[PDB]
């Protein structure tokens, strides 16, 4: 592939330039300068040069990577105090400080956890279900799967029972694994498994009253069903195996299964990504897309059952840095969090971003004044939340897993002065490009192919559109138990189908433009990109989130439009006017971004409960579950048709 290069192959596709990676290499000096917690976090040479030793075993390379970084801090978790009422009652809560596990501890607790497990009698080879957010006992668990040799199933808090049944039926776990606020869910799908020989318990803390409690009913439960089964806490795990026997190495082969990510498409049937070996080797050796060698100071927030919260854990770690959690699965914490954690790095999803910018918007509201315009207000809240919210320290960031807005691209540079990565990639694949531009490696060969249903074909001008096609050195072997499934997915030539429809801006740069599932036809032959228009629309301050609902016997759009709190309560006196107020404000977007009229919604419903992770509607990247959403919202649209 070095041989079809050409004088028009991207540079970008390789390295970034410009004359100012010299003044960001400057600014991250300054910022280096008076921090003495970030002078401790550059990556080590010596470390990296062992970790990538061509023919290490994935656990070799592992114990390098955290034997080698030694007593530095790898994750940061807030800490909590127990508080006990006058009553006898006692809690926990959080406090307003983070404590951090180093490098050379998370091996040894792996270590201690695979030891008890082995004891117990889990072997290499069995599927380990894990149901939680993301944590440092979740950073153990799944550290203690690759040293135990084990399969990893992190499953989505918000699948139903009946389908995370199913995928239970499919990998006959040895091994239930949960965080404490997910253990009645746990204890259902347990009763339903009969292979569990091991409920393992943990973000626990026992002396808070409620978490004893989960606990007690566990185990009355599973008594009660006749269940000869360990329920173990992770602590007590740790504790216990710090003194057995190691467990035997793991098995070598680089094709052995390490780990399984579930998706959907739009049937809603979840099938498990496998990943071997070699595959979550590349999550550990190299982080997407780095703009420069920077002390990284990162933040968890996505679930470990999403490719996106191994990105930031495994690629934090992969240098040296210090990834630190979010204390909250509803993200409630998350910008007290920040302002504790002043992160360097922060690889966001869309919606996040657009809690940012709702932040923003409502401060701005509430600092309104007639002796500064609202742009000197804005400026100035923007340095606040730079400053405050996020920490001041923030030299990389970058947003993936779903499209984000120019918008939004400008107000995040704008805010965080610097650049915004664009990141797009999948499960399937691995990363695919960086601000448009394919990553070579590990991409080595893509095309587009025309879908004229939608009218997009390789001859548009002025850019070739079509569904995006790839073979990629990331490239996943298939899904779990599903050879017909992964077949369909792969053409005649042996290209990955994406499933997304993209124009090709040049050679190797490309622009994205949506689901290929998710574009709509209009009544009279229009096409409507819909995640382009709800990230339009979102950046209104009225509204909060939006789902955009068309039909093809239809000559226009609608929409279910979740207004902001601030909106909602503006108007709480005056129901009938936040309806035609949000109307205008979609038509002012619409001109903004030069959309066309029937890209324009011309009714809708407002929802006062916003979509969530834990309803369903919302994935746990937090992307809308279009099928979920139809499911949901469809009798009201085509009534709100109909009439
Ligand atoms: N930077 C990105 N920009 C636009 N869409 C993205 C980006 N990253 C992921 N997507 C979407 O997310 C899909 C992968 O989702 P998943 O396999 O569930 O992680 C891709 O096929 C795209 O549809
Ligand atoms: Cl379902
Ligand atoms: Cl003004």
């Known amino acids: 592939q070095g041989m079809t290069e050409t004088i028009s192959t991207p540079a970008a596709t390789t390295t970034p330039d410009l004359a100012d990676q010299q003044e960001l290499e400057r600014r991250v000096a300054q910022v280096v300068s008076n921090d003495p917690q970030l002078q401790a976090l550059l990556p080590d040479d010596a470390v990296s040069g062992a970790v990538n030793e061509p023919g290490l075993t994935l656990i070799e390379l592992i114990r390098r990577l955290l034997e ?18 006058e009553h006898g009652a006692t809690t926990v809560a959080l406090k307003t400080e983070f404590v951090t596990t180093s490098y050379r501890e998370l091996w040894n607790r792996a270590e201690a956890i695979a030891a008890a497990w082995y004891a117990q009698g889990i072997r290499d080879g069995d599927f380990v279900a894990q149901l939680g957010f993301t944590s440092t006992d979740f950073a153990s668990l799944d550290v ?7 399969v990893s199933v992190p499953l989505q808090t918000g699948a139903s029972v009946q389908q995370r049944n199913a995928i239970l039926e499919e990998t006959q776990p040895t091994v239930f694994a949960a965080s404490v606020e997910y253990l009645e869910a746990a204890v259902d799908s347990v009763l339903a498994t009969p292979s569990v020989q091991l409920l393992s318990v943990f973000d626990y803390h026992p002396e808070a009253d409620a978490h004893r409690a989960a606990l007690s009913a566990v ?11 360990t329920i173990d806490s992770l602590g007590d795990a740790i504790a216990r195996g710090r003194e057995l026997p190691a467990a035997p190495q793991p098995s070598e082969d680089p094709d052995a299964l390490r780990l399984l990510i579930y998706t959907s498409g739009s049937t809603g049937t979840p099938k498990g990504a496998m990943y071997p070996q070699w595959l979550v080797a590349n999550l550990w050796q190299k982080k997407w897309l780095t703009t420069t060698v920077i002390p990284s100071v990162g933040v968890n927030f996505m679930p470990m059952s999403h490719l996106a919260g191994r990105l930031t854990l495994m690629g934090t770690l992969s240098g040296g840095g210090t990834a630190y959690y979010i204390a909250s699965s509803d993200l409630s914490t998350f910008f007290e969090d920040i302002a504790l954690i002043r992160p360097t790095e922060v690889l966001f999803v869309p919606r996040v971003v657009e ?14 004044a007639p002796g500064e315009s609202n742009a000197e207000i804005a400026e ?18 970058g947003s993936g897993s779903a499209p984000l807005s120019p918008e939004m691209n400008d107000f995040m540079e704008s805010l965080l002065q610097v650049a915004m990565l664009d990141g797009y990639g999948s499960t399937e694949a691995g990363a695919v490009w960086r601000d448009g531009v394919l990553q070579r490696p590990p991409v080595t060969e893509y095309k587009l192919v025309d879908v004229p249903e939608l009218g997009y074909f390789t001859t548009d001008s002025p850019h070739p559109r079509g569904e995006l096609r790839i073979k990629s050195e990331t490239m996943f072997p298939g899904y779990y138990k599903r050879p017909e499934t992964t077949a369909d997915v792969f053409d005649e030539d042996g290209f990955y189908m994406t499933g997304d429809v993209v124009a090709e801006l040049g050679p190797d740069h490309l622009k994205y433009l949506d689901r290929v599932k998710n574009v709509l036809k209009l009544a009279q032959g229009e096409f409507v990109a819909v995640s382009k228009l709800e990230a339009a629309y979102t950046g209104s301050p009225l509204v909060r989130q939006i789902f955009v609902y068309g039909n093809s016997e239809r000559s226009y759009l609608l929409a279910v439009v979740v207004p902001t709190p601030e909106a909602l309560e503006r108007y709480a006196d005056s129901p009938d006017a936040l309806k035609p107020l949000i109307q205008d404000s979609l038509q002012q977007v619409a001109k903004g971004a030069e959309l066309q009229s029937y890209e324009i919604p011309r009714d809708f419903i407002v929802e006062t409960v916003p979509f969530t992770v834990e309803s369903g509607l919302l994935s746990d990247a937090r992307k809308l579950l ?5 499911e949901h919202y469809g009798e009201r649209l085509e009534a709100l048709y109909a009439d």
């Not at 203690?144 to 084990?150: D, E, I, V």
């Open 380 to 397: 100035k809240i923007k340095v606040r939340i730079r400053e405050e919210d996020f920490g001041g320290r923030v030299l990389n960031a």
């Open 144 to 150: 203690a799967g690759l040293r135990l040799g084990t």
């Open 219 to 229: 185990r009355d439960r599973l008594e009660t069903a006749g269940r000869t089964i």
């Open 68 to 85: 080698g970084y030694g007593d530095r801090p790898a994750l940061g978790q807030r800490a909590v105090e127990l508080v006990t009422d």
């Open 355 to 368: 809690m940012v910018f709702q932040r923003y918007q409502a401060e701005l509201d509430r600092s309104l």
């Open 626 to 630: 279009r099928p979920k959403l139809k």
